[PDB]
Design a protein around this nucleic acid. Structure first.
Lengths: 47, 82, 64
RNA sequence: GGGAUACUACCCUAGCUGUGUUGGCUUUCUAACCCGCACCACUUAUCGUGGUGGGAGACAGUGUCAGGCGGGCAGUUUGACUGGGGCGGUCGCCUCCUAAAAGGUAACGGAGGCGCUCAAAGGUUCCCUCAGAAUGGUUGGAAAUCAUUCAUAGAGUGUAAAGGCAUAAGGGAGCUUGACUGCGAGACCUACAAGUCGAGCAGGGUCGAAAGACGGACUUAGUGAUCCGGUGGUUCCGCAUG
RNA sequence: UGCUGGAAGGUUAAGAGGAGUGGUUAGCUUCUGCGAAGCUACGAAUCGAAGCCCCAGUAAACGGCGGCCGUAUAACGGUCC
RNA sequence: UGGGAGUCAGAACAUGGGUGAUAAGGUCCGUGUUCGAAAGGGAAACAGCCCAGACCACCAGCUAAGGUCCCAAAAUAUAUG
RNA sequence: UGAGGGUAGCGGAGAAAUUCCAAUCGAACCUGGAGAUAGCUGGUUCUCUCCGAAAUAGCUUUAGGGCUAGCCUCAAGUGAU
RNA sequence: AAGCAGUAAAUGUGGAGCCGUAGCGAAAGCGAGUCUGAAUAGGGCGUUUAGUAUUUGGUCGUAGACCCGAAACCAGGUGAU
RNA sequence: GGAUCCUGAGUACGACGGAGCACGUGAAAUUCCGUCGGAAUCUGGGAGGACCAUCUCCUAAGGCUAAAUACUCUCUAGUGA
RNA sequence: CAUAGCAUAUCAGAAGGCACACCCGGAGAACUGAAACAUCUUAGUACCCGGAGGAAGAGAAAGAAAAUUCGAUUCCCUUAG
């Protein structure tokens, strides 16, 4: 349970933010969403 | 003074200027509010949306019409002849 | 003698066409993780001073 | 076996030598330097002066620099509220009652919560639908579990009460990642700071047969400017140009 | 606690030791690291004085000379420290 | 829309209410009124009550609340009890 | 007890008491900074006319202070709102 | 404007400078557009004439700035008749 | 012409500490101060507000310098909404 | 012996005060404001010292510009709160 900062591959900035739970979700979560650099919903992962 | 003992039930909120904002007959905007509420005392009907806080907004511009909904319930209509 | 200016306030607002004063918002420059997106972009604007504070501060800006 | 003698810092277990010039350990010298250290004198001025001898001696002392001690000293601070002050107690948000059928509304007035949580308790699609009561029975403490009818949502609904809810917003299955970017006319509240709800717009995707529906949880609380500092990217300036 | 004393076991400067390096470049390769000998600027391996941790002592020093159940260590049994 | 201000200690009445002791010319809110900033008449005197708002004369008149044996202007007025 | 002297204010002196240091002292007196400061009190100079409040939210190291708003006033504008 | 002829005036002289006549944008820049941007859009800000010089009056500001009034702090001095 | 020669030393410069320069030993690069250190000498050296390359300028560490400016104890003569 | 010291023998160069108004130095606070206060400001003020001249000081290019440099210095206005 921390301020979670996902790093995109090549969107180039430290943008997206969410909640996690270390007990529920200790590992690195990844999923789809709009990186506006490309006009598409693309994958990003925790880093 | 001398020993004035203490208490605790001295805590409350800052109220939220709730309820209606417009009335049966008057004409409106598109982003206009008509009712700040909690829950659903009245259900939106025509050309109305229920936002996050159960806040009702008329989709469009027009007059308002509160009315019953079912046998025992309430709704809202908005009509744009104007 | 010559009137001075509020230098620190020089750095916080811009003068408009007519006479108004175009300000930066606040509640920024730090953590927004505790905030929404609508709430994040709507602060990515600039507003105008109100006439009331203007009344309070008019003598400060002689030189804009 | 316990490290481990190819090589390589290299060695306690070593011995040893003095090497261009030099510093540590320590003694002796002494001029340096000191001596409120005795004698000779300008001055018949024990000042001073110097010579004398003696001492100590490169020591300290002194300058700078750096440290730690320093109510010995100095300058300040030492919150407010309050049926006087004080002690006590409290100081920021959320929900109800007072609050007088719009909203609003005080009291050292009355009652409760908060300083989060859920990648599933989120999103979508498709199913289901209450406890409870009796009804009663291997259990039976009564009732666990199971069984039939009524049950008003009382059940249950992540977190206080409130409204609300079976359109289920309740509960299950599968999929999931819209807990997306850039905007929004407009409207609410409000002294300001602020805070709140937004059609829809392009955009692009998840799910769904599609229709469509998703800009976080049924709502309402889950901290706090600004400066400063930090990190990274940077339609940018950055000193005559680079 | 203060005051001493002490094993001084360790941590401590100002200091020594130098293994090594930006902003701009005439400099090795001319898509580019021996940092070179050059302005705006620098390091470790180690030790490091008072002292701070450790131990004895210290009440005509400061200080305490108590408490609980039997009971206004005011007597005593249990006692705690 | 702009210019220039003052106010932040309010008080009593009725009235809804809380607190207090169904105490207080108490105390906190609210809804109205008056004073504050409003003289005059009535309430014997009587900042908040009842009537009513003064531009200045006048030896003119009508009325309100109040009142009509003397002080003190108006009825020992009726008729009833 | 005298005549002469010696001690100076962050200081002196003191058989100690805030005691004395030129009729005064929890640190004298003269000057100067200095028209120190004062959200505190008091005071504040001739006339007539017209309008005419407030004693309330809110935030305050704030509460008998202050800043916006509220309710005033003046003049520009619009103009049935 | 300074400065100059003049006289302790004027008037003349004197154009270094200042305001406006286009704005948007942090800025590079662009221009009746500009910023965000992705478009121009959408929106903000614009746009779509009139101002400038002197002076009067009112306010505000800096200088003690309506007036008097402290306790006290500091510097240098006087004093032990 | 200028080859060579001359061209201001514990000076320049650096570290530490401090003042100042609108700008807080920090950039103080500029400029003063101490304690430590501590240079080149044209073929050199310095500056160019972090900074430097290139470019511009200059050539330090030796000295003297009217003018326009300031005040009035005065003096003279005069002036005074 | 030397010159110092001492001696004479010349000369007066000295102090002193002072317009400390202005100027240059040396040293060098508080009250204040910040609504408290320490950084900061009051201010390099005030006061003392010393020089003190009729003015003083500064002053001729290691400069400022990317200049084409008023060309040393000083002074006035703007740049500009």
């Amino acid at each position: 349970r921390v301020n979670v900062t996902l790093a995109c591959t090549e969107c180039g900035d430290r943008n997206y933010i969410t909640t996690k739970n270390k007990r529920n979700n200790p590992e690195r979560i990844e999923m789809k969403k709009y990186c506006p650099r490309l006009n598409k919903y693309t994958l990003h992962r925790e880093t | 003074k001398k020993g004035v003992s203490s208490t605790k039930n001295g805590r409350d909120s800052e109220s939220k200027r709730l309820g209606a904002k417009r009335a049966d007959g008057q004409f409106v905007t598109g982003g206009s509010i008509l009712y700040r509420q909690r829950g659903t005392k009245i259900y939106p009907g025509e050309n109305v949306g229920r936002g996050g806080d159960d806040t009702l907004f008329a989709k469009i511009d027009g007059v308002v019409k509160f009315e019953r909904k079912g046998r025992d319930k309430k709704q809202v209509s908005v009509y744009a002849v104007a | 003698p010559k009137m001075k200016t509020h230098r620190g306030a020089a750095k916080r607002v811009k003068r408009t066409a007519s006479g108004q004063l175009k300000r930066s918002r606040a509640f920024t420059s730090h953590l927004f993780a505790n905030k929404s997106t609508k709430q994040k972009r709507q602060l990515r604007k600039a507003r105008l001073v109100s006439k009331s504070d203007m009344k309070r501060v008019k003598q400060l800006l002689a030189y804009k």
